[PDB]
């Protein structure tokens, strides 16, 4: 694309500058350009990719929720049209991320940390699609999210310790999927509780810095359990 002429290292450098400037659309375009160079991404680079697109889609999700609430309260064409416009842009971003994962980040990811991170992302972006889905493919979108999360869970349980932040963030997001998308609050609670308890029992193995990383995610599990019970 438009980033094809820029050096990979320059794209990464500019992604970091865009982050500092809170220019997340730019950040995502730079990281898409970096992915399209065809090389695998390092851990730091995978995190930059995720930060960029999560912030872009986050603004779209927040706007969609505002507009959907207005639309539901109203029930001319303008509210529906504008909600649809935001929805379509949101779906486009999700399709873009899913396309990067399919071409060819996931298939080249052999190490647990990369493969789980990308499969979790695949689940997340199908989950964002599911939040707005209403048609004959809502069930299939939900199943796609579930399938990606499940593959990531299976690998994470075999290959990562229970405190690994990627494993924790995956389990957290799969629990949110169960509660918010799949009409499965009991599964959500069970997953969050077992994840929390098994992480707590493994904290003793960690350095101070890793402890901080793991307990930050554990706090989110606890917060959700408080909300859900």
């Amino acid at each position: 694309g438009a980033m094809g002429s820029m050096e990979r290292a320059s794209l990464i450098q500019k992604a970091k500058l865009a982050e500092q400037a809170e220019r997340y659309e730019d950040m995502a375009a730079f990281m898409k350009g970096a992915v399209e160079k065809g090389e695998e991404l390092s851990c730091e680079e995978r995190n930059l990719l995720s930060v960029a697109y999560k912030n872009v889609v986050g603004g779209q999700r927040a706007a969609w929720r505002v507009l959907s609430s207005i639309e539901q309260k109203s029930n001319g064409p303008e509210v529906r049209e504008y909600r649809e416009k935001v929805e379509t842009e949101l779906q486009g971003v999700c399709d873009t991320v899913l396309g990067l994962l399919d071409s060819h980040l996931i298939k080249e990811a052999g190490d647990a940390e990369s493969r789980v991170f990308y499969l979790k992302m695949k689940g997340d972006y199908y989950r964002y699609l599911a939040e707005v889905a209403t048609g004959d493919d809502k069930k299939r979108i939900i199943d796609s999210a579930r399938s990606a999360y499940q593959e990531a869970m299976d690998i994470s349980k075999k290959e990562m310790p229970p405190t690994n932040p990627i494993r924790l963030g995956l389990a957290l997001n799969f629990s949110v999927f169960h509660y918010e998308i799949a009409n499965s609050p009991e599964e959500a609670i069970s997953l969050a509780k077992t994840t929390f308890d098994e992480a707590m029992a493994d904290l003793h193995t960690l350095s101070e810095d890793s402890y901080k990383d793991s307990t930050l995610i554990m706090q989110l599990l606890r917060d959700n359990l408080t909300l859900w019970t």
Binding site: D124, N173, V176
Partner: peptide
Amino acid sequence: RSHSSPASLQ
């Protein structure tokens, strides 16, 4: 709404 993961994970 429920809390989901931060984007950056180590």
